[PDB]
Design a binder for these strands. Sequence first.
RNA 1: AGGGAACCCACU
Lengths: 49, 404, 51, 479, 49, 35, 115, 260, 46, 67
Amino acid sequence: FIGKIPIMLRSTYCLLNGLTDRDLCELNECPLDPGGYFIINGSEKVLIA
Amino acid sequence: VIFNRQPTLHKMSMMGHRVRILPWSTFRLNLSVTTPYNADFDGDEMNLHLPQSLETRAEIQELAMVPRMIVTPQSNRPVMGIVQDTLTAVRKFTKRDVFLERGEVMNLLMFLSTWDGKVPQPAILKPRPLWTGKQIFSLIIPGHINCIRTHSTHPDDEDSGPYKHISPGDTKVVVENGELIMGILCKKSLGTSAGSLVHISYLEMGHDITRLFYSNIQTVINNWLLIEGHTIGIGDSIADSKTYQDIQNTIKKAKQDVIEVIEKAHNNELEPTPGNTLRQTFENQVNRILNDARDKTGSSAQKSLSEYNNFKSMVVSGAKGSKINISQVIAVVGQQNVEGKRIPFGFKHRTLPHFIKDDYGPESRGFVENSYLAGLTPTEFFFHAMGGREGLIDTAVKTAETGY
Amino acid sequence: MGKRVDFSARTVITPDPNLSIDQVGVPRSIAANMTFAEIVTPFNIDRLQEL
Amino acid sequence: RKLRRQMDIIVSEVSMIRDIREREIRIYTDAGRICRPLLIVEKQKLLLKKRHIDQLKEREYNNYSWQDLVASGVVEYIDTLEEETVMLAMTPDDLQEKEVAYCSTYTHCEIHPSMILGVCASIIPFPDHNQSPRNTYQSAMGKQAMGVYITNFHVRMDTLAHVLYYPQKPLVTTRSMEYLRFRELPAGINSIVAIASYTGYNQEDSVIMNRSAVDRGFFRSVFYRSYKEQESKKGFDQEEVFEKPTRETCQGMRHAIYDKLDDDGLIAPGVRVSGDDVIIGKTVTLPRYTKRDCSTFLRTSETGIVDQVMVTLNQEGYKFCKIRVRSVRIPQIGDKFASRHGQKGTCGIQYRQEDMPFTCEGITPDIIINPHAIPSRMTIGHLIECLQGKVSANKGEIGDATPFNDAVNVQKISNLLSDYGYHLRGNEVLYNGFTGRKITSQIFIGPTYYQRLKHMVDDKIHSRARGPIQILNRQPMEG
Amino acid sequence: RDGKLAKPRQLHNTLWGMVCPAETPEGHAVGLVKNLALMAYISVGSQPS
Amino acid sequence: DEITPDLWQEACWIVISSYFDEKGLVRQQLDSFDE
Amino acid sequence: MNAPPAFESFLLFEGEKKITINKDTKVPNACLFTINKEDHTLGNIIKSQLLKDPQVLFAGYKVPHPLEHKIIIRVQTTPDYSPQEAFTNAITDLISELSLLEERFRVAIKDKQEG
Amino acid sequence: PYANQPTVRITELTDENVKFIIENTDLAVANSIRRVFIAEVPIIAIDWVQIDANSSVLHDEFIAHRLGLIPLTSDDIVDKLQYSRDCTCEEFCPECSVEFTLDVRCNEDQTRHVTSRDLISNSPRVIPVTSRNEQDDILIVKLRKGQELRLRAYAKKGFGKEHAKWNPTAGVAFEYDPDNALRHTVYPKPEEWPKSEYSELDEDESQAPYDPNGKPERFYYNVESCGSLRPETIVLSALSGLKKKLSDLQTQLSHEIQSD
Amino acid sequence: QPMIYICGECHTENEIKSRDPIRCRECGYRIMYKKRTKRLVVFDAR
Amino acid sequence: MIIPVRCFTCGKIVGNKWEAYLGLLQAEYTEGDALDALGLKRYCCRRMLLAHVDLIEKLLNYAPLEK
RNA sequence: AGGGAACCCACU
Ligand SMILES: [Mg+2]
Ligand SMILES: [Zn+2]
Ligand SMILES: [Zn+2]
Ligand SMILES: [Zn+2]
């Protein structure tokens, strides 16, 4: 173990990757939420190009 | 209280007001004071300061109250005039053929704070008693001031022909002995320019009488506007088919002229003017052709407008808009410029990948040949976006330079 | 050269064609939160006592 | 190019530029090159054929997707450098033969020119009919508009959130709005708007609103604020604990009542709260004795009802609470509104239904905006939207305001509106509400999509008369 | 944003189809913060081997 | 074979719809992070 | 925060008077009638009825401010008449017309319902 | 110097609208009657809601607002009821209110629609209009399994001037001088304006000739009811209410004149 | 005294004592919600 | 989120029309025909139905807090 | 009894 990497939501290595809308709603996630951001201490962060 | 809007650019950015308590959560302002503050009601916020002693209260009362600020020493002319609805409406109100019945007159007199309670004799007694707009407005004018002005649509040769003193179009404003004898009121007569009616009222009567003059114009005219109405719609943006064909012919001829200039330059038959390289000469000729086309189409569009057209109503009153705005809505939008030049070749020898290389024609370099009503083509849309970006940037940088 | 000050207020502005040019409409909550110190005299003691 | 279009050795992402005048060929596989897809033109024909459209129409079943278009070499990604060498047709109409051909050597065609716009500018109807700074202004204001920001908002404890009661999708849309999910999560209401002078209270960009409509839920919204707090046991000397403090033991208790708290030191959902009301009771033991109040109070000047109360442990295992307070916001004088055309204003006054001007049917405007906005702003898109919206409400369809559409012009819309029994330019005869008299001028009136912006006067109003001061300089605090 | 040259804040011709010509903040950042056009894509890179 | 104008409008929006069905709107973020 | 209660537009506050009468001193035989918690409905009908009276020289009304609930009616009559008399007679005429209209509407409804 | 003598004709009378013409009156009276239809005809509506349970996806004020907007049959009761502010009762009594209760829980796997049919009244004659024995019931909220709504509400007398929920109309059509003989409007291009349904012009004529001696007579109304009152009862209640306003003003003015 | 909380996962009510860590007795979930108040809540229907 | 009870503009009841309108659409009515069948004549009421987005179904997709 | 700095977004 060498550290932890914050994971971008709905990316390949997120727990939501590939879930159906019904599965997302069971997790209390909005199916329309596009992802593409991080959660750091509860706060949603987006990287600006 | 002292009222203030930032940035505080001149004396009239901080003026004294008397407080009136009202229900909801906003500061409420009379429309005429928006001009000194450079304020509007699209989310602006203003500051209030309450003087805390009789001495500061007396200072504000005697030096800085709004009425004392009506004329500015920056340019020896009023800083406040009649604006927006009141201006458009008063222009309509004072037209020669505005007639009011007994009841309408009584209502308007209801809104005249300085009225002495005597209903004037109507201008028309038979077959029916009718008052004109000019008679009521004469009731609004203070004292016995004397003022001559001209309406904005006053023809230039009228003053030298016959009818100099009996205007066919009612375009000469004459206030004599406090009475509006003739003429259509507009920005030239009720605005902030030197020698306007409001200026003469301030100079002849005090700040107090003139304060009442501002307020009464507003209350009486707004209440008449409740009958007259004022709108702007799609129908004001249209022109007749003959006008459209004339505009299209003008544009087509201008395009062919630019083609001829290009073909001349391509054969080395073009000679530079003194003090100009050949490319500057070619650009001068092209820009001249396109400017002439824009002017001619604008004139055609302006000629097509009827007296009921609402764009024209707001332009002639001086309340909002210009003849250029009308030309761009009805006729072409015209040339788009960046840094004073036609659209540059941002790609290699091309303004966009949709053109061929070395295309100096109007479409390629940013001449928008459509009106806003017709809608811009994609390339015109992008070139117009480049042009507009220029203005946004100018604002956002000039501010700091000027502030320093 | 500049400072923050007491006895000041700020809010959105909205038009009122029914005010004189020298008036300003002020909401009640602002009017209730800002004060002017009035000196008691025999002229005004009753009015101020009720206040 | 053949290899890239087959996807054999060169992936679609790769850029290959030939500078003919120079004698350089430049190939880029870097990351970070911006590109866009374009239709390939060979000779003077699209490689995209009717069969590709047929296969895409059934993509639900046959699974034929966008990737198959790219694989069949019918579409290509072109980055800016390669675009320098492309001869691009705006529409397939440019490939049609013409008396004097302009180019006749096109290599590519646009899929649709409206794709030049981003997400926010794609919701503007008829943007090609507005002055460009106005499109720029809407592009910002649309990000300030209240809607339903996300479907799972009930489970989110965001610091700030606004939710509109009754969002509608616009009667007049662009085709690119289908992909932005604006239908699903709309941020506005189609409003009956009249462009008129009426009593003077919409001058200088202000608007007049119908109070009876507001009474019925027009643009009513709800504001949420979340407060968070945690109890820290950092040191054996001092520890913070959630509790309902009492004035005998705790010392720094404000004069606010603490009886709204439960025995766990927390307020319960459904309790009404006002500014300077305690919502989380918390005490810290000292090194009126042995306890210092450090409770959380509702922000000053705000009010609402506790919506929900969540209790957890944070990362280091300390007890942790978040409290969401809800506040219903009824639109009022000073609140800010905007159409999609950069026409923004604050509400200047509200009239009840009977005071509003009316058509010969019972119809009164929801909003009255002032005609002096248009002439210098030149937002003709707004007027055309109103005209088409009137047609679309009468006909029972959604108007198409996609920008560069030749099948739509003002005359066609006007002709349609005449068929439904209205004046073809959108004007109506209105009657004055106060007196019942007709208004001499006829009034432009129709449905227009309006937005309620987050800027509300009750979050801005502020006054001071000798309050708190800064420590270093003794001048009034900021904010 | 403190710099006052217009040139990098201008809408360059090559933004066509890549960056929205309309969406940009109207403050100090005008022209410096941009937004992708709807169909724009950014390459992730690949090996030239 | 050839798409005709009256069909062209529907065809172009079908192509664009398929594009967005495949990619979404934040594909650049997700692809960059996956890489 | 600063919203007035809705009932404020039609409920008299404690001590507030429904109607006050003052003389207009600029001209003879003129009165101002201030009415609290009324709006254009009453003001307009009363003014129009007064204009029907041949002994009324001036009749008009206004709402001084839309956010307040007061109307002012100004009436001037000939010297052989009184503005108080004109105001009273105008209200009586309006009541009579409304009573007749209600009777006739009842009769018309009955006719329509029968056939 | 005296009163008008209006006449009335009913041209259409259904359960939801009444269409009629008033002749030989003045525009001010016609408009005042219109205004009274909208804002000063009393009606019964829910104006007090106590929520005992609400597990729906809609917050309490949302539900309460929707309940306030449900029209209730008021046709004969409303004249009997007193205004709650005037009643001597301490909270709410049958002389100034009507009690409603609602208690719905979703125990099944299909969505439960809470409609106005679930509003149970204490008065058989004051009920949701859609519950009167086609028109569906008004949706209040939708529940999924395990969610519940339980509340108690009181309906009281009021008029549209206070809140639009007490407005009995669903559109008041009003119109005079269909052919523009008085020129109270001026058409820039008269020929492109469609005819009024009350026009009596030929298809080749756009507007009537100007009438210099004309006055507005003959006002056309189409009063549509929201269901709380019958349309004719709306009209009659308006006439009576405007008359009452005038009578009260007359009494106050008599006191004021006598007091000086 | 009871202080009933609802589990965020299994929706089970369960007692919690101040100074007791947050944890559902059934499923061990660490997020709980307070129950609606018993105080009188009354709205005008406006 | 849920169909408004009244038309904002005129106050006509529309809150009892949404399920019927959805029914008519699935029975192959065009929106204009369905709105005519429901008696929605003024374009304000028609706007109410035409532009509604029934977001409450999406909200009903989430499990409630209390069983 | 009451902090502060930094940065970001936004409004006129
Ligand atoms: Mg501004
Ligand atoms: Zn009672
Ligand atoms: Zn559990
Ligand atoms: Zn309606």
